């Protein structure tokens, strides 16, 4: 297709490896580029962890309001919200928002602990039919992003299908689905990624990821004005362990997709 050829050209100009999956909910069409190759998820895995806790809240009705102590020993490498609440508490809802809207790694680790470890996050993926997602480590070691390492990986196709089922489908209860959408629409970290390549009037909820090997990710649910919603996953990784972030590549892929 023309879109796949422009994405292929983008990838060549970038010096890295690009993976894209688009789902059009208008006619259920899919556009894929390296859609079945594995990429390190990095912080895009936070969506599965928050959704698994939302799923627990369907039976534990008050769960999102439960306070969780934040201790100095809990802090890891990137804790923009958790550091504000040391020697205090945050609710599970506040921790979910911190992970999803600020990429907070201490918050992610609290969600994983609430699910019984990384295997509890992968478990929720399996329960909703995602056979590809695997979470193996906590943050930040899940961001090592080493080529050929299957740990903490998924494919663009699997992630797009899962994001659709969580935000637009019915993998979650209706209040939980709305909560997850609200959280994603308020993300603060994606202004230079998928959002920077789409029309300014569209509404977007997104979750970014970043890691070693210059890994730069974004997964988004997109509401175009006057069109059925879209789900778009853009994953990007580079040959050098120390490569810099390339959010511009995700914006360019989103622009390529949107024009097609």
Residue numbers in the entry: 27 to 57, 59 to 238, 240 to 252, 254 to 289
What is the paper's account of this structure, in its own sentences?
The CTX-M β-lactamases are class A enzymes that have a broad substrate specificity that includes penicillins and cephalosporins, including the oxyimino-cephalosporin cefotaxime. Structural results suggest that the slow acylation by the K234R enzyme is due to a conformational change in Ser130, and this change also leads to decreased inhibition potency of clavulanic acid.
The structure of the E166A/K234R apoenzyme was determined to 1.8 Å resolution and contained eight molecules in the asymmetric unit. A clear difference in the structures is that the hydroxyl group of Ser130 is shifted in position relative to that in WT and is directed toward the guanidinium group of Arg234 in all eight chains. This rotamer has an χ1 value of −60° compared with −150° found in WT CTX-M-14 and nearly all class A β-lactamases. Interestingly, this serine rotamer is preferred in general surveys of protein structures. The presence of arginine in the K234R enzyme, however, shifts the equilibrium toward the ∼−60° rotamer, as suggested by the E166A/K234R apoenzyme structure, where all eight molecules in the asymmetric unit are in this rotamer form. The Ki for the WT enzyme was 80 nm, whereas for K234R it increased to 390 nm, as expected based on previous studies. This can be rationalized based on the changed conformation of Ser130 to the χ1 ∼−60° rotamer with the serine Oγ turned toward Arg234, which would interfere with the covalent bond formed between a clavulanic acid acyl-enzyme fragmentation product and Ser130 that cross-links the inhibitor between Ser70 and Ser130 (11).
